[PDB]
Design a protein around this ligand. Structure first.
Ligand SMILES: *[C@@H]1O[C@H](CO)[C@@H](O[C@@H]2O[C@H](CO)[C@@H](O[C@@H]3O[C@H](CO[C@H]4O[C@H](CO[C@H]5O[C@H](CO)[C@@H](O)[C@H](O)[C@@H]5O[C@H]5O[C@H](CO)[C@@H](O)[C@H](O)[C@@H]5O)[C@@H](O)[C@H](O[C@H]5O[C@H](CO)[C@@H](O)[C@H](O)[C@@H]5O[C@H]5O[C@H](CO)[C@@H](O)[C@H](O)[C@@H]5O)[C@@H]4O)[C@@H](O)[C@H](O[C@H]4O[C@H](CO)[C@@H](O)[C@H](O)[C@@H]4O[C@H]4O[C@H](CO)[C@@H](O)[C@H](O)[C@@H]4O[C@H]4O[C@H](CO)[C@@H](O)[C@H](O)[C@@H]4O)[C@@H]3O)[C@H](O)[C@H]2NC(C)=O)[C@H](O)[C@H]1NC(C)=O
Ligand SMILES: *[C@@H]1O[C@H](CO)[C@@H](O[C@@H]2O[C@H](CO)[C@@H](O[C@@H]3O[C@H](CO[C@H]4O[C@H](CO[C@H]5O[C@H](CO)[C@@H](O)[C@H](O)[C@@H]5O[C@H]5O[C@H](CO)[C@@H](O)[C@H](O)[C@@H]5O)[C@@H](O)[C@H](O[C@H]5O[C@H](CO)[C@@H](O)[C@H](O)[C@@H]5O[C@H]5O[C@H](CO)[C@@H](O)[C@H](O)[C@@H]5O)[C@@H]4O)[C@@H](O)[C@H](O[C@H]4O[C@H](CO)[C@@H](O)[C@H](O)[C@@H]4O[C@H]4O[C@H](CO)[C@@H](O)[C@H](O)[C@@H]4O[C@H]4O[C@H](CO)[C@@H](O)[C@H](O)[C@@H]4O)[C@@H]3O)[C@H](O)[C@H]2NC(C)=O)[C@H](O)[C@H]1NC(C)=O
Ligand SMILES: *[C@@H]1O[C@H](CO)[C@@H](O[C@@H]2O[C@H](CO)[C@@H](O[C@@H]3O[C@H](CO[C@H]4O[C@H](CO)[C@@H](O)[C@H](O)[C@@H]4O)[C@@H](O)[C@H](O[C@H]4O[C@H](CO)[C@@H](O)[C@H](O)[C@@H]4O)[C@@H]3O)[C@H](O)[C@H]2NC(C)=O)[C@H](O)[C@H]1NC(C)=O
Ligand SMILES: *[C@@H]1O[C@H](CO)[C@@H](O[C@@H]2O[C@H](CO)[C@@H](O[C@@H]3O[C@H](CO[C@H]4O[C@H](CO)[C@@H](O)[C@H](O)[C@@H]4O)[C@@H](O)[C@H](O[C@H]4O[C@H](CO)[C@@H](O)[C@H](O)[C@@H]4O)[C@@H]3O)[C@H](O)[C@H]2NC(C)=O)[C@H](O)[C@H]1NC(C)=O
Ligand SMILES: *[C@@H]1O[C@H](CO)[C@@H](O[C@@H]2O[C@H](CO)[C@@H](O[C@@H]3O[C@H](CO[C@H]4O[C@H](CO)[C@@H](O)[C@H](O)[C@@H]4O)[C@@H](O)[C@H](O[C@H]4O[C@H](CO)[C@@H](O)[C@H](O)[C@@H]4O)[C@@H]3O)[C@H](O)[C@H]2NC(C)=O)[C@H](O)[C@H]1NC(C)=O
Ligand SMILES: *[C@@H]1O[C@H](CO)[C@@H](O[C@@H]2O[C@H](CO)[C@@H](O[C@@H]3O[C@H](CO)[C@@H](O)[C@H](O[C@H]4O[C@H](CO)[C@@H](O)[C@H](O)[C@@H]4O)[C@@H]3O)[C@H](O)[C@H]2NC(C)=O)[C@H](O)[C@H]1NC(C)=O
Ligand SMILES: *[C@@H]1O[C@H](CO)[C@@H](O[C@@H]2O[C@H](CO)[C@@H](O[C@@H]3O[C@H](CO)[C@@H](O)[C@H](O[C@H]4O[C@H](CO)[C@@H](O)[C@H](O)[C@@H]4O)[C@@H]3O)[C@H](O)[C@H]2NC(C)=O)[C@H](O)[C@H]1NC(C)=O
Ligand SMILES: *[C@@H]1O[C@H](CO)[C@@H](O[C@@H]2O[C@H](CO)[C@@H](O)[C@H](O)[C@H]2NC(C)=O)[C@H](O)[C@H]1NC(C)=O
Ligand SMILES: *[C@@H]1O[C@H](CO)[C@@H](O)[C@H](O)[C@H]1NC(C)=O
Ligand SMILES: *[C@@H]1O[C@H](CO)[C@@H](O)[C@H](O)[C@H]1NC(C)=O
Ligand SMILES: *[C@@H]1O[C@H](CO)[C@@H](O)[C@H](O)[C@H]1NC(C)=O
Ligand SMILES: *[C@@H]1O[C@H](CO)[C@@H](O)[C@H](O)[C@H]1NC(C)=O
Ligand SMILES: *[C@@H]1O[C@H](CO)[C@@H](O)[C@H](O)[C@H]1NC(C)=O
Lengths: 121, 222, 448, 121, 121, 52, 42
């Protein structure tokens, strides 16, 4: 272990070795902490809601049936996990993040679980 | 730091009345009660009464009821005492005391960790043994006290011409500044105070205490 | 054969802790107009159906003397008293010289005045004109200097008048705990207030506890189940108060004979002071009656329980209060808005050795009070029209024992209870706060 | 059913019959309840986060691949579930709770799901 | 997609095509929003707690082993999903909602997971 | 002729600050998560009852 | 003090009226203030 955000400067594959550590910790002047610790759990549940609506719910890692479009910075498998950091990576895919999100939440668990609805009728 | 500042001593005549004051500082006045105890030479210590700074509530001893009056000034943190119809029996050194444990939540009155300097006034059970104890520096002094009621017992040390200091409370627990040389033990109704490796400062007179009752005292001399 | 760890979520596992409790009142308490009666308005309505669960086989240790609910309730009512007086009328220009005289009566001189007819200058709505108006005040409310008088609180603190809209009448209050926590309740016949409890049950909200402010006597208190109960943190300690709980309630009647007149003088512009006008009828003093028979039996039932802790064959004497502030020495309480202070030398005047009318007690009235040993806040209780009558339950005592006895082997008890936290300990002895930790791991022959 | 905390004094095995009932319910003077009901959901999500990082996520019950060390009060299978309450149990294992927690969160789902990471590359 | 609550007036079967969209978005005067957004996440986690205690946890859809009592508006399969809206439906079953809930939370995951407890001992 | 303020036997008085302005501002009222606001878009909705 | 005049006073011994606890009576009390705290008029 390297503590919180330990492998931030490490490759994404090596940064995958420390995923559980960063999710773990995450009268006036007394309200300063209240208004903040409320937004903290809202930022948490915003992330868990997104994690739930997708084909995930179960945290840490999960698979999805969405093909990677080449326009989203066409890199190779060994050129990503062994030659790039998450900070450097999120910077490139930042443009397409809002787009990918829409394809995970709508195209998947709305059509995938609906498969079972046709099997349930 | 907790400090009890008493007014000086005085000489009174029989039939007169006397008054003493005691200004507390270093803590919140309203938290815990103040006590008044008289010490006469070669006599069992007498607890007269206590006063709560809260609502000025008080509780005296049978012996003094109708003669004694305790009040306080919350603003100046000063406690007042009055005793009427003075007789030679009244002659003694009067102290104001405060327990050790005294928080906002609760307290324990009878572990007197804090003592005023005392006021010498002249007008003109617990079985403690031995009465006296003559020992050399380096030896070990064993003072004993037999009770009959049980409950957090304390040990005090009085140096010649000084106010008594809390040495031990709850029968086995040392107070602040008390070295390992002082130790307490208990077996049934019996209580033992053991002082190992005697030195000049240790010599004086020692008292055992259970609430408002005291022992007859044990004088340890060099 | 080799065991494996397994996580369980929702297990009956709790630990003693302290949390922030919220309130609860019955619907009818909101439904009654009340206008203002404490801060009960923001309070959550009580669950119409009571929910309780008797924990079989469970033995939990309680401690009424180390209970945090008492401290929280104390500060809650304290902050409540301030919030109830913040938007009220402040009486800063009422510290003018008072040219007072005796009230209209025919007195030998043993009545010692008590009531004073004070005349003074006052600020009207306009800045320019003075106002020569007269009022009526109790002797305990005024003090002469160097006949000219002044308000008793002038070198103490400032003063604010209680609003006529608000009421000090006690309301049943239920204290509840948030999610993740629970309140334990001892349901024993004879739980003397400390240690392990055989029959333990759980509740979300406690029963209706009326925050009755009183000393010495547990006025409008609550009862015990079998034998009258005696609770003390340290019985051998005479510095610790001894809270007594009765089985049968003592019927007492307190009245204010002086039918009064409210005079509404306008300090201005929008602020009005209420002054006592002239009395109509006879000049009599407030008093409280205690059924002699009921009190004799009740004391006789208590003294039989006191022997169980101070020896079977001993003498128990009752004597009045030793001294102190007027509120502690007398029986302090509220009734109909006025604050009475009654002489309890007629209740603790007994001597019990070897095991048809009412007892009346002289009662004084103060309008200027400073309860909870409040600093910087003095509240003036406005005059109340009509004769005030109140009938209540004495269900407990707060006694104190005299020390340095040794020789006689006898005990004398005097009324006390200066601190008001003891008044809450008489209702919260059965309750305590615990936190639920539903995460518990346990081994079993289970692998993936 | 025996209501909330019903089988507290019952054995751990019998107390397992009532797991769902205790998880179900779980101007001034008005802030008294707000500051409390905020700490309530924080106490909840603290438990749910711990429940998520481990090999659980799904509440109530879950298995783990962690061997029971004998130093942790060496009792038998029949001596635990049929001769001990949860209150009595947690009191003994209280000393080792912080230790076990570390082995569930770190050694497991950080290494167990990482197995899939080597299978995903 | 038809946005939030899109298929509200559509049949329950057609309204099942838009389940993910409605779960996605879901000094004074500044406290006006705070006291409200606190009640929002309490309203959210109340639904997720109920969704967790049942045989669900995983959101959107889940199966349960509870037989449909005929007294609960005896309708046919094709008379529900192709001839009724969720608004129109919930209005009829409103009477028995509290009843069904008790059968899902108690009768199921308290007895269903307890099956594994007998298998774990 | 001697006069006085009209509010003297009514209430106290406080002066509006010259910094502040009473000019109406467009205000949008919104609902938190879990709630929603319904809007009638009818040509002739006379203010009560069902909306098409 | 005993000052040549280069000390420029600095400290001032001011006397004034004051409101007591009671409304009616004025209070003639004196205090001490720094020159930077006070300013003379006319
Ligand atoms: C209400 O409620 C409440 C609650 O809920 C309650 O409360 C209560 O109260 C009471 C009164 O106050 C109390 O009682 C008390 O107690 C105490 C304590 O107890 C405990 O302990 C014990 C022991 O002790 C010890 O130890 C401990 C530990 O272990 C500690 O802590 C302590 O402190 C002590 O210590 C000491 O000692 C030691 C040695 O020993 C040393 O080391 C040290 O240092 C010190 O010194 C125990 O034991 C107990 O237990 C018991 O009991 C149970 C039942 O209960 C059982 O089961 C068990 O088993 C046991 O038993 C045993 O023992 C006995 C005796 O005791 C015997 O008999 C038998 O057989 C068996 O063996 C517990 O745990 C105590 O202490 C006390 O006692 C005392 O006192 C009494 C009177 O009061 C008497 O009677 C008795 O007898 C005793 O006395 C004795 O002792 C003392 C001292 O202490 C003295 O002073 C005297 O004199 C005598 O002596 C004798 O003895 C000895 C010994 O043996 C000898 O040596 C000699 O020689 C002689 O002989 C009391 O009891 C309680 O606790 C409470 N509880 C709670 C929970 O908290 C109430 O009550 C209610 N109320 C109503 C009305 O109901
Ligand atoms: C805006 O918007 C809004 C909303 O959005 C609107 O609102 C509106 O308003 C209006 C006005 O105001 C209204 O109207 C009204 O209404 C009423 C009600 O209605 C209902 O109901 C009915 C019935 O009635 C009854 O019943 C019920 C239950 O069922 C109840 O509730 C009631 O109250 C009543 O009761 C009564 O009666 C009974 C018997 O009957 C008894 O028992 C009791 O006791 C009492 O007495 C019903 O019917 C209706 O329905 C109807 O309609 C529908 C459509 O709409 C349809 O679909 C259906 O089917 C039906 O129809 C039926 O009927 C009719 C009649 O009515 C006929 O014709 C036909 O054919 C059929 O058959 C509903 O549901 C009412 O009442 C009224 O009426 C009346 O009035 C009027 C005027 O106003 C007239 O015209 C009429 O005619 C009538 O009259 C009559 O009657 C009366 C009484 O009532 C009388 O008085 C008179 O005289 C007359 O008499 C007659 O008749 C009778 C009977 O038959 C006989 O017997 C006799 O002899 C004679 O002949 C009115 O209409 C409404 O409602 C509302 N809506 C809502 C939604 O709300 C507004 O409008 C707007 N605006 C604008 C501008 O736009
Ligand atoms: C901060 O950033 C620096 C530089 O960017 C990182 O340093 C690099 O770390 C990586 C590991 O993640 C190194 O890659 C590995 O090097 C190992 C060591 O090389 C051995 O052999 C050489 C030659 O004899 C000697 O230096 C020495 O004897 C070493 O023992 C190799 O052993 C590794 O190969 C093995 O592991 C891989 C998996 O990683 C297997 O797939 C292989 O089959 C093989 O078994 C590997 O090559 C790299 O060399 C380091 N230096 C660089 C890149 O310049 C820090 O790790 C990084 N730190 C943090 C905290 O982020
Ligand atoms: C509070 O605490 C008390 C005591 O600690 C508990 O009482 C014990 O409860 C357990 C059950 O949890 C009892 O154990 C069971 O006793 C049953 C009854 O015994 C029968 O037979 C005897 C002899 O004829 C008679 O008393 C009577 O006819 C009874 O009908 C047995 O039938 C049980 O055996 C069966 O069940 C087990 C599973 O539990 C199976 O594995 C067996 O194969 C068998 O089929 C069992 O022995 C115990 O006897 C009780 N008394 C004690 C321990 O002294 C309370 O239950 C507890 N309450 C709560 C709410 O926690
Ligand atoms: C608001 O409410 C209105 C009325 O309630 C709804 O309108 C109905 O919508 C349903 C669809 O949900 C319609 O049902 C379908 O109609 C289709 C169209 O019919 C075709 O053929 C006829 C005759 O030639 C012509 O009108 C035209 O050529 C159409 O192309 C059918 O094709 C459908 O059948 C097929 O689909 C079903 C699945 O739904 C399959 O199971 C079949 O095998 C088949 O392949 C179907 O019948 C209905 O007709 C509409 N009108 C009504 C009920 O009156 C709105 O949709 C609704 N809107 C919203 C947003 O809620
Ligand atoms: C107004 O107040 C005055 C007070 O000055 C009061 O006059 C007083 O009346 C009392 C009696 O009511 C007088 O006291 C008397 O003293 C003599 C001794 O000097 C006694 O002998 C008298 O005893 C008789 O009266 C008692 C009263 O009931 C009986 O109980 C008893 O059996 C005897 O019959 C009595 O104690 C007092 O001297 C006068 N004082 C003066 C200055 O006159 C007056 O009555 C009051 N009037 C009203 C209308 O209130
Ligand atoms: C109170 O304040 C007064 C101020 O008026 C002060 O009296 C003054 O004393 C000073 C010296 O302390 C005098 O200044 C002198 O001026 C003459 C020229 O006129 C010089 O020759 C003097 O020089 C001698 O003294 C110096 C001071 O130490 C030495 O350094 C030098 O070597 C010389 O020996 C000196 O500068 C001033 O004239 C008087 N002023 C008046 C009005 O008398 C008085 O001493 C103060 N007293 C107290 C008790 O504070
Ligand atoms: C206190 O007052 C109550 C009523 O205000 C008294 O109760 C009354 O007792 C008489 C008997 O003397 C009955 O005739 C009445 O019906 C009772 N009234 C009620 C309302 O029950 C009570 O006796 C008084 N007690 C004391 C000590 O003064
Ligand atoms: C991939 O991205 C391009 C834009 O560069 C877009 O035209 C194309 O439709 C995308 N692929 C899919 C499957 O949508
Ligand atoms: C006094 O009470 C405390 C705690 O309430 C207890 O520890 C102590 O033993 C008691 N003392 C006596 C003499 O019972
Ligand atoms: C089990 O606990 C002991 C301490 O008693 C420790 O030495 C040992 O390493 C532990 N077992 C494992 C696998 O860590
Ligand atoms: C837990 O540890 C403490 C000291 O750290 C020890 O006193 C206690 O006995 C231990 N618990 C058990 C069940 O052994
Ligand atoms: C179905 O509902 C009826 C009431 O109409 C009830 O009597 C019956 O018990 C229910 N079925 C079951 C399995 O409980």
């Amino acid at each position: 272990f390297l503590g919180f955000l330990g492998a931030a400067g490490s490759t994404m594959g090596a940064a995958s070795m420390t995923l559980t550590v960063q999710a773990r910790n995450l009268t006036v002047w007394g309200i300063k902490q209240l208004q903040a610790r409320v937004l903290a759990v809202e930022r948490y549940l915003r992330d868990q809601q997104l994690l739930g609506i997708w084909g995930c719910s179960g945290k840490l890692i999960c698979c999805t049936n969405v093909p990677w479009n080449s326009s989203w910075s066409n890199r190779n498998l060994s050129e990503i996990w062994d030659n790039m950091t998450w900070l450097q990576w999120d910077k490139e895919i930042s443009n397409y993040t809002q787009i990918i999100y829409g394809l995970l939440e709508e195209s998947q668990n709305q059509q995938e679980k609906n498969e079972q609805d046709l099997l349930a009728l | 730091q907790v400090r009890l500042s008493q007014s000086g001593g005085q000489m009174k005549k029989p039939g007169e009345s006397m008054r003493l004051s005691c200004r507390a500082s270093g803590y919140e006045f309203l938290n815990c009660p103040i006590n008044w105890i008289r010490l006469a030479p070669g006599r069992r210590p007498e607890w007269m009464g206590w006063l709560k700074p809260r609502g000025g509530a008080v509780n005296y001893a049978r012996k003094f009821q109708g003669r004694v009056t305790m009040t306080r000034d919350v603003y100046s943190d000063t406690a007042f005492l009055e005793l009427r119809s003075l007789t030679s029996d009244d002659t003694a050194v009067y102290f104001c005391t405060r327990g050790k444990y005294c928080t906002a939540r609760d307290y324990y009155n009878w572990d007197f960790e804090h003592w005023g300097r005392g006021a010498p006034v002249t007008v003109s059970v617990l079985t403690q043994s031995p009465a006296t104890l003559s020992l050399s520096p380096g030896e070990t002094a064993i003072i004993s006290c037999r009770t009959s009621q049980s409950g957090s017992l304390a040990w005090y040390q009085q140096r010649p011409g000084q106010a008594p200091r809390l040495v031990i409370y709850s029968g086995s627990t040392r107070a602040a500044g008390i070295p390992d040389r002082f130790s307490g033990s208990r077996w049934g109704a019996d209580y033992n105070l053991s002082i190992s490796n005697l030195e000049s400062g240790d010599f004086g007179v020692y008292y055992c205490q259970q609430y408002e009752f005291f022992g007859q005292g044990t004088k340890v001399q060099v | 054969e080799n065991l494996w760890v397994t996580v369980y979520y929702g297990v009956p596992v709790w630990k003693d802790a302290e949390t922030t409790l919220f309130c609860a009142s019955d619907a009818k308490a909101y439904e009654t107009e009340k206008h203002n009666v404490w801060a009960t308005h923001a309070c959550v309505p009580t669950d119409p159906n009571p929910q309780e669960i008797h924990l079989e086989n469970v033995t939990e240790e309680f401690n009424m003397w180390k209970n945090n609910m008492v401290e929280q309730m104390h500060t809650d009512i304290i902050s409540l008293w301030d919030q109830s007086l913040k938007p009220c009328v402040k009486l800063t220009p009422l510290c003018v010289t008072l040219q007072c005289t005796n009230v209209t009566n025919n007195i030998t001189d043993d009545m010692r005045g008590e009531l004073k007819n004070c005349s003074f200058n006052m600020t009207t709505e306009l800045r320019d004109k003075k106002q020569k108006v007269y009022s009526l005040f109790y002797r305990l409310d005024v003090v002469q200097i160097n006949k000219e008088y002044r308000l008793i609180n002038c070198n103490t603190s400032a003063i604010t008048q209680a609003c006529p809209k608000v009421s000090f009448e006690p309301i049943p209050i239920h204290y509840c705990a948030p999610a993740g926590f629970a309140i334990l309740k001892c349901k024993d016949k004879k739980f003397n207030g400390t240690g392990p409890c055989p029959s333990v049950s759980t509740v979300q909200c406690t029963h209706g506890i009326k925050p009755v402010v009183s000393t010495q006597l547990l006025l409008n208190g609550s009862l015990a189940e079998e034998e009258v109960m005696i609770r003390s943190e340290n019985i051998t300690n005479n510095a610790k108060n001894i809270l007594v709980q009765f089985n049968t309630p003592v019927q007492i009647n307190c009245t204010r004979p002086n039918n009064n007149t409210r005079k509404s003088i306008r300090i201005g512009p929008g602020q009005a002071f209420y002054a006592t006008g002239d009395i109509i009828g006879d000049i009599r003093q407030a008093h409280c009656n205690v059924s002699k028979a009921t009190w004799n039996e009740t004391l006789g039932k208590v003294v039989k329980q006191l022997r169980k802790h101070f020896g079977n064959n001993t003498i128990i004497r009752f004597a009045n209060s030793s001294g102190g502030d007027l509120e502690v020495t007398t029986h302090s309480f509220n009734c109909g808005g006025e604050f009475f202070y009654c002489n309890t030398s007629g209740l603790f005047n007994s001597t019990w050795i070897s095991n048809n009318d009412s007892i009346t007690l002289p009662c004084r009235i103060k309008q200027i009070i400073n309860m909870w040993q409040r600093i910087g806040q003095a509240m003036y209780a406005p005059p109340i029209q009509g004769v005030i009558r109140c009938v209540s339950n004495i269900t407990g005592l707060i006694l104190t024992r005299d020390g340095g006895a040794n020789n006689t082997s006898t005990e004398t008890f005097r009324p006390g209870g200066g601190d008001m936290r003891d008044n809450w300990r008489s209702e919260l002895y059965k309750y305590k706060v615990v936190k639920i930790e539903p995460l518990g791991v346990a081994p079993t022959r289970c692998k993936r």
